[PDB]
Amino acid sequence: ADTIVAVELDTYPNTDIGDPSYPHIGIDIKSVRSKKTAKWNMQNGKVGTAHIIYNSVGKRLSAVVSYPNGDSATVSYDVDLDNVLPEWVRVGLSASTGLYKETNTILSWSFTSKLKSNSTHETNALHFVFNQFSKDQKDLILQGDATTGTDGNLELTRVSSNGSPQGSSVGRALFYAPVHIWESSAVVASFDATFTFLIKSSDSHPADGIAFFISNIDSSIPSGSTGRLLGLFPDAN
Amino acid sequence: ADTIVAVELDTYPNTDIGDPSYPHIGIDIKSVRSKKTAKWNMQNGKVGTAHIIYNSVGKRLSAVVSYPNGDSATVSYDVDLDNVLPEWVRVGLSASTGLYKETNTILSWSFTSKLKSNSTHETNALHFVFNQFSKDQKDLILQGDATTGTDGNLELTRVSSNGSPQGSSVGRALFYAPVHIWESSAVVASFDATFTFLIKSSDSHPADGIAFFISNIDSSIPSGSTGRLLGLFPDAN
Amino acid sequence: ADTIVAVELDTYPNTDIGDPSYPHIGIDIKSVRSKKTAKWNMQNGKVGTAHIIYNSVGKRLSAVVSYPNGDSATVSYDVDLDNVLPEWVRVGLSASTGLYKETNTILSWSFTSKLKSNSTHETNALHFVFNQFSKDQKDLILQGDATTGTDGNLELTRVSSNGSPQGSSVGRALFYAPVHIWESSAVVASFDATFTFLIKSSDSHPADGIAFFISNIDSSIPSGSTGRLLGLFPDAN
Amino acid sequence: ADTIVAVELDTYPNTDIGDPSYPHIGIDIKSVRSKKTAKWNMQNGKVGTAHIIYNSVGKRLSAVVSYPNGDSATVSYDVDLDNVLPEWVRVGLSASTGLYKETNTILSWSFTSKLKSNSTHETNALHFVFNQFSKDQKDLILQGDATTGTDGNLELTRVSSNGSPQGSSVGRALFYAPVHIWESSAVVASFDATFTFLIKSSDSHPADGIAFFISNIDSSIPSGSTGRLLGLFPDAN
Numbered sequence: 047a048d049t050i051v052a053v054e055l056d057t058y059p060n061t062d063i064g065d066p067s068y069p070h071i072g073i074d075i076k077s078v079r080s081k082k083t084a085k086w087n088m089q090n091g092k093v094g095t096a097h098i099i100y101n102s103v104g105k106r107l108s109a110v111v112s113y114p115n116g117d118s119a120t121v122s123y124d125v126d127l128d129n130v131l132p133e134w135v136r137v138g139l140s141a142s143t144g145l146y147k148e149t150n151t152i153l154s155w156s157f158t159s160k161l162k163s164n165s166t167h168e169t170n171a172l173h174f175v176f177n178q179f180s181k182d183q184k185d186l187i188l189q190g191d192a193t194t195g196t197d198g199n200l201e202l203t204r205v206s207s208n209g210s211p212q213g214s215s216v217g218r219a220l221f222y223a224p225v226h227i228w229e230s231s232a233v234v235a236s237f238d239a240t241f242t243f244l245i246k247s248s249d250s251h252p253a254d255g256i257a258f259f260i261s262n263i264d265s266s267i268p269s270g271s272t273g274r275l276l277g278l279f280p281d282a283n
Numbered sequence: 284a285d286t287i288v289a290v291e292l293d294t295y296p297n298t299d300i301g302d303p304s305y306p307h308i309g310i311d312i313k314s315v316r317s318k319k320t321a322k323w324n325m326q327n328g329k330v331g332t333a334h335i336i337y338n339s340v341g342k343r344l345s346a347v348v349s350y351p352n353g354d355s356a357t358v359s360y361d362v363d364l365d366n367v368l369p370e371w372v373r374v375g376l377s378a379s380t381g382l383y384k385e386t387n388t389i390l391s392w393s394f395t396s397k398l399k400s401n402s403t404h405e406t407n408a409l410h411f412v413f414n415q416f417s418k419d420q421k422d423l424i425l426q427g428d429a430t431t432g433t434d435g436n437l438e439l440t441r442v443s444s445n446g447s448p449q450g451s452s453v454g455r456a457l458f459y460a461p462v463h464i465w466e467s468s469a470v471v472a473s474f475d476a477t478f479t480f481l482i483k484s485s486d487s488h489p490a491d492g493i494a495f496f497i498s499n500i501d502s503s504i505p506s507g508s509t510g511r512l513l514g515l516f517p518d519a520n
Numbered sequence: 521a522d523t524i525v526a527v528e529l530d531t532y533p534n535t536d537i538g539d540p541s542y543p544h545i546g547i548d549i550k551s552v553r554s555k556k557t558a559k560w561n562m563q564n565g566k567v568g569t570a571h572i573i574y575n576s577v578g579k580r581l582s583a584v585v586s587y588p589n590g591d592s593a594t595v596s597y598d599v600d601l602d603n604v605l606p607e608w609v610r611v612g613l614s615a616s617t618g619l620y621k622e623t624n625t626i627l628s629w630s631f632t633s634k635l636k637s638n639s640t641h642e643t644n645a646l647h648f649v650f651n652q653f654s655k656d657q658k659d660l661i662l663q664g665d666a667t668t669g670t671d672g673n674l675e676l677t678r679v680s681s682n683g684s685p686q687g688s689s690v691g692r693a694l695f696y697a698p699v700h701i702w703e704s705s706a707v708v709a710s711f712d713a714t715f716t717f718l719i720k721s722s723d724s725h726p727a728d729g730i731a732f733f734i735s736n737i738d739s740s741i742p743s744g745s746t747g748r749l750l751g752l753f754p755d756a757n
Numbered sequence: 758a759d760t761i762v763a764v765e766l767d768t769y770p771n772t773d774i775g776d777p778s779y780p781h782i783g784i785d786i787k788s789v790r791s792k793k794t795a796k797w798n799m800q801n802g803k804v805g806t807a808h809i810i811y812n813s814v815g816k817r818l819s820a821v822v823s824y825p826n827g828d829s830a831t832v833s834y835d836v837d838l839d840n841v842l843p844e845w846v847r848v849g850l851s852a853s854t855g856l857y858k859e860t861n862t863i864l865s866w867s868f869t870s871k872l873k874s875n876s877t878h879e880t881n882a883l884h885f886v887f888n889q890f891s892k893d894q895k896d897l898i899l900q901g902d903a904t905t906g907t908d909g910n911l912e913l914t915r916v917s918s919n920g921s922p923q924g925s926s927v928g929r930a931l932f933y934a935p936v937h938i939w940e941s942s943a944v945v946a947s948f949d950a951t952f953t954f955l956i957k958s959s960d961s962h963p964a965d966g967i968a969f970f971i972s973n974i975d976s977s978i979p980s981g982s983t984g985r986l987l988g989l990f991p992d993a994n
C-alpha cells in the first residue's frame with residue numbers, strides 16, 4: 047500500500063478506530079490511527095488555517111490549526127521521517143465525507159521543502175503557493191472527487207450545484223512535481239505546509255476531515271477510503 | 284511547433300543564420316534568431332552564472348551572464364510575454380553541440396514565478412532550486428542527451444566516460460511541474476531564473492551553447508535541433 | 521538635500537508643478553516632478569495595492585497600482601539607479617496632506633532587496649514584510665505625523681480620534697535597517713516593494729498621496745514638505 | 758542583565774562552569790551553562806555550517822553544526838521561547854577567545870523570523886542574508902572586537918595583520934533592525950538562522966567558540982565576557 051504521513055483535521059470521532067471522542071487534529075504516520083491528537087473545535091463555516099512544520103534536526107512533526115478568533119489546536123509528534131518516507135514523495139491535501147458530510151474547501155495551500163548543506167547555505171528547495179486555484183490547475187493532480195472552480199478554491203470533496211456537500215466523497219490534490227523530501231547528505235531536510243480551509247456543514251455532525259499528507263509519488267486514493275479513512279488509507283489498521 | 288522563449292548563451296557564431304560574428308547571449312522569442320544579443324566572452328572551463336529576469340509590469344526580459352573574474356554580458360529585450368507564451372508552460376534548460384562541441388554542464392538552477400494580485404501579498408508562486416542534481420532527479424524531465432550525474436551536475440549534452448563532450452548532441456531538462464506563467468487576473472506576473480554552468484571545450488571552437496527556455500508544457504526537442512538550433516527550434520527561421 | 525527615488529501615488533494634480541491634470545502614479549528621481557507618470561484613478565475608500573519592481577539588469581523602475589475591481593495603472597521609467605542612489609539607503613513610505621486631505625493608511629508593506637553575485641545563489645538579501653503594524657513597531661522609524669495603530673495599520677498622515685484625516689500633515693515610515701541597495705561586486709541588484717493602502721477622503725478633493733521611496737540612510741522629512749511635496753522633497757524643482 | 762537565548766559552538770570545555778569535557782554545541786537559555794549539549798568535533802581550518810531552527814508550534818530549539826565531510830552534531834531543547842525572550846529582540850553572532858584562541862570567522866549568516874496567522878497565510882517577516890560582508894556593513898551593529906573586512910568575512914574576534922587570532926577577544930555582530938520574535942496572536946512564530954564559519958587555531962587547544970544569539974534589543978557585550986562566557990553572559994551562573 048502507499049506510505050502516508052499526514053496531518054489530519056478530523057472533524058468526526060470514529061472511536062472504534064481509535065479517534066478520541068471529539069473533533070481533533072492528529073499526526074498520522076502510516077496509519078489513520080493518529081500517533082498523536084489534540085482536541086480541535088472546528089468552527090463551522092469559518093476559514094481555518096493549518097500549519098504543518100517538520101525538520102530533520104528537531105525531528106518533530108508539528109501542526110497547528112487556528113481560526114481567526116484565535117482558537118487553536120496544536121499537535122506535535124517526535125518522529126524521524128527519514129525512517130518513514132521514501133526519499134521522493136508527493137505532497138497533497140485530502141479530504142472525505144461519509145455518512146455525515148461537510149464542505150472540504152481549500153482556499154489556499156503553500157508548501158516548502160528544503161534540503162540544506164553538506165556545505166555553505168546552498169540548497170535544493172521546492173516552494174509553491176496557491177492563494178487562488180484555477181479551474182484548470184495544471185500543477186495539481188486532482189484525484190477522486192477533488193475539483194478546482196472559478197471561485198479560486200479547491201473543493202476536495204463533492205459539492206452540489208447548490209453548494210451543499212455530498213456524502214461518501216473522497217478527494218485529493220497533489221502537487222504535480224515529486225518532492226525530494228530527504229536526502230541523506232542533507233544536514234537539514236525541512237518542510238512546511240500551510241493551508242486555509244473552510245469546513246461548512248448543516249449536518250448534525252460534520253465529517254470527515256481534511257488532511258495534508260505526504261505519500262509515495264505514485265500515491266492514489268485507496269479504494270474504500272471515504273469516510274473515516276480520509277482518502278489516505280486502505281483500512282483502519 | 285512548440286512556443287519558445289529563451290535566453291541563449293550562444294558559444295558558436297552561426298553568422299549565416301543571424302548570429303553576430305562572436306559568441307553572444309541572446310533573447311529568443313519564437314526564433315533562434317535572437318531579437319536581441321550581446322557580445323559574450325565564454326570563459327572556457329570556467330563556471331559562469333546566468334540570471335534571467337522578467338516581470339509583466341516592466342515587460343522586459345533581461346539576462347546577465349557572468350564569470351568569477353567579473354566579466355559580464357547583459358541583454359534585455361522589451362516584450363510582452365503574455366502575448367507570446369501560453370498561460371501554462373514548462374521551463375527548462377537546453378543545450379546542444381554540432382560539429383563543434385563543449386560540455387554543457389549545469390551545476391545549479393533556480394527558478395521563481397509569481398502571479399501577484401489585486402489584493403496584498405496573496406500570490407501564486409512556484410520556486411525551485413537545484414544546487415545539486417541527483418542521478419534520479421525525479422522532478423526533472425530529461426530530454427534527449429541530458430543526464431543527471433553522481434557529480435551532482437546536470438549534463439545537458441552527451442559527455443563520454445572519459446569526460447569528453449560529444450558532437451551532434453542535444454538535451455534538455457524541464458522542471459516537472461507546469462508553471463502558470465501568466466494569469467489574466469494577476470497584477471504582476473514575474474519570473475526569474477538563475478543557473479550556473481561550466482562550458483568546457485578542447486575543440487577548435489566550442490559550440491553550441493546553453494539556453495534557459497520556457498515552452499508549451501508538452502515541449503519536446505524538435506527533430507534535428509542539434510547544433511546551432513540549441514535544442515529549442517525545428518529550424519533557423 | 522536627501523537623495524530620493526520614489527514611486528508616487530499622487531492623488532492631487534498640482535498642474536502648476538508638472539503634475540498631469542489628473543491623479544496619477546509617477547516615478548520620482550530626485551524631484552517631485554515625476555520623470556514618468558500615468559493616469560491613476562484613486563478609488564476613494566478602497567484598498568489599493570502598489571507593486572514596485574527594479575533590477576539592475578533591465579534598469580527599469582516599474583510600478584503598478586491596482587484595486588480590487590481590477591483597475592490598474594502602471595508606470596515604468598528606465599533609469600540606472602546605481603547612478604542615483606547611494607550604496608546604502610533606507611526605504612520607506614511617505615504621505616502628505618495639504619489644503620486637501622485624505623487618510624494615508626498603509627495596511628501592509630513588504631520589501632526585498634538582493635545583491636546577487638559572480639557565483640551562484642550566494643546573495644545578500646533583505647526581506648521584510650508587515651501585514652500588520654504594531655503600536656510599537658520597533659523596526660520602523662516613524663517620522664513626522666506617522667503612527668502605527670492598534671488597528672494594525674500604519675497611518676502615514678495625521679488622523680483625528682474621530683477617524684478624520686487632517687490637512688497639512690506629513691509623515692513617513694522607514695525600515696529601521698539600512699539597505700544595501702547596490703554593491704559594485706554584484707551582478708544583479710534588485711528590489712521590490714509592495715504595499716497596500718486605503719486612501720479615504722470626504723474632501724472636495726483628496727490630497728496629496730503616498731510614496732514608496734528610497735533615500736539616503738539619514739533621510740528626514742524636508743521642512744515644509746506637506747502637500748504636493750509628499751514628504752519627500754524640500755521644494756518642487 | 759541582558760536576556761540571552763544562544764546556540765553555542767563551544768570549542769573549549771570549561772568543566773568548572775558545567776561544559777562537558779569535549780568541544781560541543783549547546784543550547785543556552787539565560788545561562789552559559791547550556792540546557793543541552795552534544796559533542797562536537799570542530800574541524801580546524803574547515804568551513805562549518807550551523808543551522809538553528811525554532812518554531813512556536815513544536816517549541817523545540819534545534820541546532821546542527823556540520824562540516825563538508827558530513828560530520829555533524831545536533832542538539833535540541835524543548836523550550837517555549839515566548840516565556841524567555843522579550844517580544845522584540847536583536848539577533849546576533851558572538852564569539853570569544855581567552856587564554857586559548859582561534860579565528861572566529863563568519864563567512865555567511867542568514868536569519869528568518871516569521872509571525873504567521875491569526876488568519877490566511879499573511880505574515881510579518883524579516884529575512885536577511887549575508888553571503889559576503891562588506892567593510893562597512895551598515896546593517897550590522899559590530900560590538901567589541903568584531904570587524905568586517907574586504908575578504909567578505911566577519912571576524913568576530915581579533916585577528917592580527919598576519920592572520921593570527923588573538924586572546925582575550927570578544928566580539929559580536931547584531932543585525933541592525935530589531936526583530937519581532939513573538940507576538941501572542943501569532944499562530945506560528947518561527948525563526949531560523951544559518952551561519953558558516955571558519956574556526957582555525959594553531960593553539961594547543963582552540964577557544965572559545967561562536968554563538969548565534971537572540972537578545973534584548975539593547976544588548977551589549979557584558980563586561981568580562983571573553984573566554985568561556987562567549988560574549989554573551991556577565992557571569993557563569
Ligand SMILES: OC[C@H]1O[C@H](O[C@H]2O[C@H](CO)[C@@H](O)[C@H](O)[C@H]2O)[C@H](O)[C@@H](O)[C@@H]1O
Pocket residue numbers: 058060143144145146147252253254272273274275
Ligand atoms: O451506520 C453505518 C456507519 O455510519 C457512520 O460511519 C460512516 O460515516 C462517517 C462519516 O461521518 C465515517 O466516519 C465512516 O467511515 C462511515 O462509514 C458511523 O459512524 C458508523 O459507526 C456506522 O457503522
Ligand SMILES: OC[C@H]1O[C@H](O[C@H]2O[C@H](CO)[C@@H](O)[C@H](O)[C@H]2O)[C@H](O)[C@@H](O)[C@@H]1O
Pocket residue numbers: 295296297380381382383384490491507508509510511512519
Ligand atoms: O554553430 C553551428 C553548429 O550547429 C550546426 O547546426 C546545423 O547542423 C545540422 C545539419 O543537418 C543540424 O543537426 C542542425 O540542427 C543545423 O541547424 C552544425 O551542426 C555544427 O557545426 C555547429 O557546432
Ligand SMILES: OC[C@H]1O[C@H](O[C@H]2O[C@H](CO)[C@@H](O)[C@H](O)[C@H]2O)[C@H](O)[C@@H](O)[C@@H]1O
Pocket residue numbers: 532533534617618619620621727728744745746747748749756
Ligand atoms: O496638491 C497641492 C497640495 O499641496 C500643496 O503644497 C504646497 O503648500 C504649502 C505652502 O506653504 C507647503 O506646505 C507645501 O510643501 C507646498 O508645496 C498645498 O499645501 C495643498 O493645498 C494641497 O493639498
Ligand SMILES: OC[C@H]1O[C@H](O[C@H]2O[C@H](CO)[C@@H](O)[C@H](O)[C@H]2O)[C@H](O)[C@@H](O)[C@@H]1O
Pocket residue numbers: 769771854855856857858963964965983984985986
Ligand atoms: O589559568 C587561568 C585560566 O586559563 C584558562 O581559562 C581562560 O582561557 C579559556 C580560553 O580558552 C577561557 O575558557 C576562560 O574564560 C579563560 O579565563 C583555564 O581554562 C582556566 O581554568 C584558568 O583559570
Ligand SMILES: [Ca+2]
Pocket residue numbers: 056057058059060065254255274
Ligand atoms: Ca475520524
Ligand SMILES: [Ca+2]
Pocket residue numbers: 293294295296297302491511
Ligand atoms: Ca550559434
Ligand SMILES: [Ca+2]
Pocket residue numbers: 530531532533534539728748
Ligand atoms: Ca500632486
Ligand SMILES: [Ca+2]
Pocket residue numbers: 767768769770771776965966985
Ligand atoms: Ca566553553
Ligand SMILES: [Mn+2]
Pocket residue numbers: 054056065066070072078080
Ligand atoms: Mn482521527
Ligand SMILES: [Mn+2]
Pocket residue numbers: 291293302303307309315317
Ligand atoms: Mn545566437
Ligand SMILES: [Mn+2]
Pocket residue numbers: 528530539540544546552554
Ligand atoms: Mn505628481
Ligand SMILES: [Mn+2]
Pocket residue numbers: 765767776777781783789791
Ligand atoms: Mn559550553
